[PDB]
């Protein structure tokens, strides 16, 4: 009851009465005594002393406040910070938050490569105007790159960063290349040998057939996948030998599979899996796809496909003296059993460099060709479309961005509703003072916002909204906020049904009167503002009382009244069977209860 001990003179000198409001508080004492002491008690000024004594903690807080938070990224492994290393970088993720150092170049590289990917994808919407739409997008895209407002017609050239998108977009500019290749996300390069194209067939389901191409001669290459080097030689649709330099379990598997596809080694180039027969669609919406990229995509779906591909490659038992340089199905460095024609080692294979620049030729499918075919890049080797917010950018030509969503549609509808006020005749306040609400049910803006409404039960929403509107207009007691909130629904014939307390749009979102929400919120002491997803909007007018009267914006045929606990709690349905002079409590929100009375 009074476990907490205390002092006596310290209590009386503060004049702490027991049972202040039936709370004893107490030598011994309760805990509520602390609340009574900190809410109504003596006042000191010892802030400076506290800060000085707890200087270490408050300096830590200051340092924390002295941070410039940066982005984060999911990845792996190939003092003042120790206080926060727990929140700075784990093992699967990491945040690049910095303290004092600034250098904006690699972020600029990421931005430029992302936007290049974006634009090159956008150009994949026709069959004939590929290069034209591409170049026009480029010329219509400017950026505040770093600190300089530059255009995207010179950065692609001035930059030196190999990539499928950089190359795919620069070839159209007759720009210089570096003899590098891109088969999917992997990076390849030629070392020696040469050959010519040759065609072959492959079955699907055991009946159909499809043609692919390859090379028949010997040729050596240099593969390089994330955290993994390699070297190998392809000969007649099959992989002869291969060696890997830098070891990571996951990377070695994907790199090996990609090099195998590049060599088309394996039986799945004779027949196909039973999963492909489910589709047999080596085609886009309206375009064609080779077999290699189909196989790759089939790999990306699940690692079981990768394991199957690797089993297709012969597996054998390792012999002595080779464990140190053997491999396993899961990339294991050494194992009693390994795969045929493999060699693991340590140290990344030093990559060669080609100092011979060239220019390629784009095709209908934007595929570039330097000579003897030997595709260097394409859209097929790109990721799927990934929406990302772009800043410091200007994109003027159509297809720049859809920039059309239900959220933005609603935002614009509400902006139009707000501007319509216009502090003039033939606008909201004139109709209010005139008590002509019917015209409100015919404005253009509500007609533009109507399509955003849930169609199945729009009649009841319109009924309720018209009820509220008329009841707030006729009497003259109203609140512009809730009105504008519900107006978009006062545009279809009213009908009978069951209402619950929320008005749903077509995007599954909703709005509710007498409450606030992310889509629409407002509050007093800032009534000149209306938040929309946090976007504060302004009112072309000023009001101090036009909103203060919300007694009719909560329910339809009721009005708020003084609080009364005796009144019984109810729901929205039984309301119909109430009478007059009969108060009722009811929830108006989350843990928000209010009393109401008919009329």
């Amino acid at each position: 009851k009074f476990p907490i001990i205390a002092n006596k003179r310290m209590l009386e000198e503060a004049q702490i009465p027991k049972e202040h409001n039936n709370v004893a508080l107490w030598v011994l004492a309760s805990a509520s005594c602390i609340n009574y002491w900190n809410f109504c008690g003596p006042c000191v000024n010892n802030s400076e002393v506290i800060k000085e004594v707890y200087k270490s903690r408050f300096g830590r807080l200051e340092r924390r406040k002295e941070i410039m938070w940066k982005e984060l990224r999911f990845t792996l492994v190939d003092p003042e910070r120790m206080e926060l290393i727990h929140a700075l970088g784990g093992e699967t993720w990491i945040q690049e938050a910095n303290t004092a150092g600034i250098s904006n170049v690699d972020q600029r590289k990421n931005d430029i490569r992302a936007v290049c990917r974006k634009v090159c994808l956008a150009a994949n919407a026709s069959i004939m105007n590929a290069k034209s739409k591409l170049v026009e997008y480029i010329k219509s895209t400017s950026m505040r790159i770093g600190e300089t407002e530059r255009k995207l017609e010179e950065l692609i050239l001035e930059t030196d960063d190999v990539s499928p998108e950089v190359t795919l977009c620069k070839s159209a500019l007759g720009g210089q290349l570096g003899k590098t290749l891109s088969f999917g996300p992997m990076l390849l390069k030629k070392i020696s040998g040469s050959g010519v194209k040759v065609k072959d067939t492959v079955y699907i389901q055991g009946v159909r057939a499809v043609q692919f191409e390859y090379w028949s001669e010997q040729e050596e290459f240099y593969g390089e996948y994330k955290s993994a080097t390699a070297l190998f030689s392809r000969k007649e649709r099959s992989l002869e030998w291969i060696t890997i330099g830098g070891g990571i379990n996951e990377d070695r598997k994907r790199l090996l599979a990609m090099c195998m596809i590049f060599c088309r080694d394996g039986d799945y180039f004779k027949d196909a899996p039973a999963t492909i027969t489910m589709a047999d669609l080596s085609t886009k919406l309206g375009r064609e796809i080779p077999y290699q990229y189909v196989m790759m995509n089939w790999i990306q779906k699940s690692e079981d496909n990768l394991e199957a591909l690797l089993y297709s490659r012969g597996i054998v038992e390792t012999n002595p003296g080779k464990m140190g340089s053997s491999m396993g199905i899961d990339g294991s460095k050494r194992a009693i059993k390994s795969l045929r024609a493999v060699t693991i080692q340590s140290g990344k294979i030093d990559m060669p460099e080609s100092k011979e620049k060239i220019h390629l030729e784009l095709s209908d499918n934007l595929e570039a060709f330097d000579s003897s075919g030997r595709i260097v890049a394409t859209i097929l080797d790109l990721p799927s479309d990934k929406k990302v917010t772009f800043q410091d950018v200007s994109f003027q030509h159509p297809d720049l961005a859809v920039l059309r969503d239900e959220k933005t549609a609603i935002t614009k509808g509400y902006e139009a509703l707000i501007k319509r006020l216009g502090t003039g005749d033939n606008d909201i306040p004139s109709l209010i003072a005139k008590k002509d609400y019917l015209s409100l049910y015919n404005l253009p803006e509500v007609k533009l916002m109507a399509p955003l409404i849930r169609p199945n039960r729009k009649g009841v929403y319109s009924r309720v909204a018209r009820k509220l509107v008329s009841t707030q207009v006729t009497t003259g007691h109203y609140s512009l906020h809730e009105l504008i909130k519900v107006l978009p629904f006062t545009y279809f014939a009213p009908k009978q049904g069951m209402f619950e307390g929320r008005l749903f749009f077509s995007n599954d979102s909703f709005v509710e009167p007498g409450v606030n929400n992310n889509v629409f919120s407002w509050s007093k002491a800032d009534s000149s503002k209306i938040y929309c997803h946090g976007i504060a909007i302004r009112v072309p007018l000023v009001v101090g009382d036009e909103h203060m009267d919300t007694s009719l914006a909560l329910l339809e045929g009721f009005s708020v009244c003084e609080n009364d606990p005796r009144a019984p709690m109810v729901t929205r349905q039984d309301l119909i069977d109430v009478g007059f002079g009969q108060k009722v409590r009811l929830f108006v929100g989350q843990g928000s209860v209010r009393t109401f009375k008919r009329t």
Partner: protein, 615 residues
Amino acid sequence: MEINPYLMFLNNDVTSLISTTYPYTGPPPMSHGSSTKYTLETIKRTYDYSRTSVEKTSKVFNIPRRKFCNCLEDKDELVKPTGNVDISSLLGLAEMMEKRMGEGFFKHCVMEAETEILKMHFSRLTEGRQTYDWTSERNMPAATALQLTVDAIKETEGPFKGTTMLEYCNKMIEMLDWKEIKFKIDSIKHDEFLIRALTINTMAKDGERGKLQRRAIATPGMIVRPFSKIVETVAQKICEKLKESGLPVGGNEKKAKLKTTVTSLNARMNSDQFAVNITGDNSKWNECQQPEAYLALLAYITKDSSDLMKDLCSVAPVLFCNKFVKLGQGIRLSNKRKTKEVIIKAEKMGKYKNLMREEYKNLFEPLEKYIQKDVCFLPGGMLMGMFNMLSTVLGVSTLCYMDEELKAKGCFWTGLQSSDDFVLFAVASNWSNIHWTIRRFNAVCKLIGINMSLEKSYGSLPELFEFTSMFFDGEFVSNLAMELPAFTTAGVNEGVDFTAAMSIIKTNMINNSLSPSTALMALRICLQEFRATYRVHPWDSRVKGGRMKIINEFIKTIENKDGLLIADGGKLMNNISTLHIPEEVLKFEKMDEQYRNRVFNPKNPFAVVSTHSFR
């Protein structure tokens, strides 16, 4: 339709889903008790794992003394546990380890432990899980029994003015020879006080993850406490320099040790050789550790050092060579219909042995010899969770073995060992010599009582092994040691419990046992636990509680609701990047100056020292 929540283990790993196999951390509702029958079975299995039959009546009690050390017999069926130790091999392994690390290694460590002890205050002994009072004959925190002991010394032969560990120990020694001792009031003689000091009680508490095999965790008194602390300090100073010692700390450092070991292995073993792993699990790590071998080892250690430490380190061992064990609650009787039920203590079960059942009888007669009044004169074993550092040192000694018989075959081993769990890494160039190496290792381990389980110890190829719930793999090292606080059991203060929980969560995040979203959920859970504990809620809530009536009445006089304290209708403002920062430091500049000064008023009747304490 049917269900099988294991099919997700087919197309996925195990390091990602293994956590779903065990329940969430917390107090075990099993109520693992410490009954008399369990204790007697334990004592029996102890005396049995001793494969000898020799004895020697003492002179201080007139009682036999099963001397199970350096007297191995009953070689048959030796795969089962053993406790008979060989001193020669033990000292040989110690010598190997010394040679490896260095000559003046043990000396440096013992010197460090000494100097650390010198400036130590006996008051440290107040920091302990629990003990057993030798006056009230119960279990309590260390501070209570310490006060009891000091005030008894005062009442009998004046106060203890040492204010240091060494004077405390010498006072205990002297008290061993006192004939009469008093305490609040009653006194006792020499023999009874000796016994009480050498008494032990079985505690039921066993709280941890993994396995709660600590049914009868020991609970010693206070006399032996400081010497045990000294020995543990030395063993710790030793385990730090050892690479294969994951006991003193865990997590980041533990993973570092793992990967260092693995990489050194990969860079050492020749191309022809191929490695393997074993998931060892030592069985009966408490019923096969003998303090006599520990004594000989400590002697060999301090051989070249101050005789002070030589004698000091030789205290706790002998105190454990003679340890009376308090038998739990005695058996009960009953008639057929069970309408009547008699209750008897342990000391008198030897008086009604003719009635107890056989299984309970055959487990009682052979031990009646060693009983004195109600306890059993256990001359060895090691039940407490003590000397864990020392046992770990012995294990590391086991792993640092190497000879020429192996070298000739081109094989060796290495690994890591916790208290009673280890991981081995064998090396060879044939699928058979591996078996020979494993058998050699098991033999050298059994020579000194360290056994191994067969139904709980497995193996596999190099990539996949498990250690202290940290299921290691080629990658994706997954931990499972997620700890949590508990307010109801430990209500230290309102102010300090939330900050402590935040620090705990931060730590768990460091050890990678927790992730951002998981940490946030745990935080929002601990906040609610705290509130419900101290019966506090925010102001927005429509609560009617006793603190809440006054808090709701006094809410309208302030605007900085954000600055309010959680203990006073407050709301949270801390997050992941603001854990080390207490909420107070985070709301100081925000609290309405009135409330601020009203809280930080040192002129009140009572981590940032608040006006929120529960003395």
